[PDB]
Homo-oligomer: A and B are copies of this chain.
Amino acid sequence: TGRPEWIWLALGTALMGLGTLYFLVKGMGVSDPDAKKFYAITTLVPAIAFTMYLSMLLGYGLTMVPFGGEQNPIYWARYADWLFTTPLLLLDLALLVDADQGTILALVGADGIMIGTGLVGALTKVYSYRFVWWAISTAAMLYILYVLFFGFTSKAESMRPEVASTFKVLRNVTVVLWSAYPVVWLIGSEGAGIVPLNIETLLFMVLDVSAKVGFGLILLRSRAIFGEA
């Protein structure tokens, strides 16, 4: 394997795998029903990302897409990852603040549109249309961030202090990290092609590990995931 980005795919694979194992072992010896929900959701996230990084590392999760008169390597497995992991991450946030079902459905639905349209944009062969899908996806992302900041922050402040403050930290982490993804896509090989694939891959790896394992480390060490005992 001589793809230059292989090193970042290997490191992502390793870090997701180690993250999954840590959460799995940490979650052993938890009986609180509420805490079990968070452990289950949060452990699945890097477990799924592990499998999809491994598929990229082994070359399964890569296809060639012709656009701009070239054969462009597109790691389609990222979207398969994000389709399942990003709603789980939003579920962690929503459960934390005890969001109502309708809000959860809107968030997960907007998230599916965001990832779905990003995959279409990534596979689209007419260059200028790629950015049409990027814009729709980014609009869906803005909707999600809107809800997290101006709906979830409303109900969280009415929750327990440990819930309010854990939510606020995870909210901020999410807004910052999630916002970088459309930027990397736009400047990387899926978009304008300014940043080469190997650096794009490093950037997504840093984002993915932070948004998944970092997020989970903050969440799962907090007392907000337990019922008041």
Q: What residues make up the interface of A, taking CB atoms closer than 8 Å to B?
A: 33, 35-41, 43-44, 47-48, 51, 54-55, 58-60, 84, 100-103, 105-106, 109-110, 112-113, 116-117, 120, 123-124, 126, 129, 132, 136
Contact = CB atoms under 8 A, between A and B. Distances in A.
A184 to B, nearest CB: 22
B58 A109 contact: no
A33 B120 contact: no
B116 A58 contact: no
Contacts of A100: 33, 36-37
A124 B60 contact: yes
A39 B101 CA distance: 11
Contacts of A105: 37, 40-41, 44
A105 B27 CA distance: 14
Contacts of A129: 58, 60
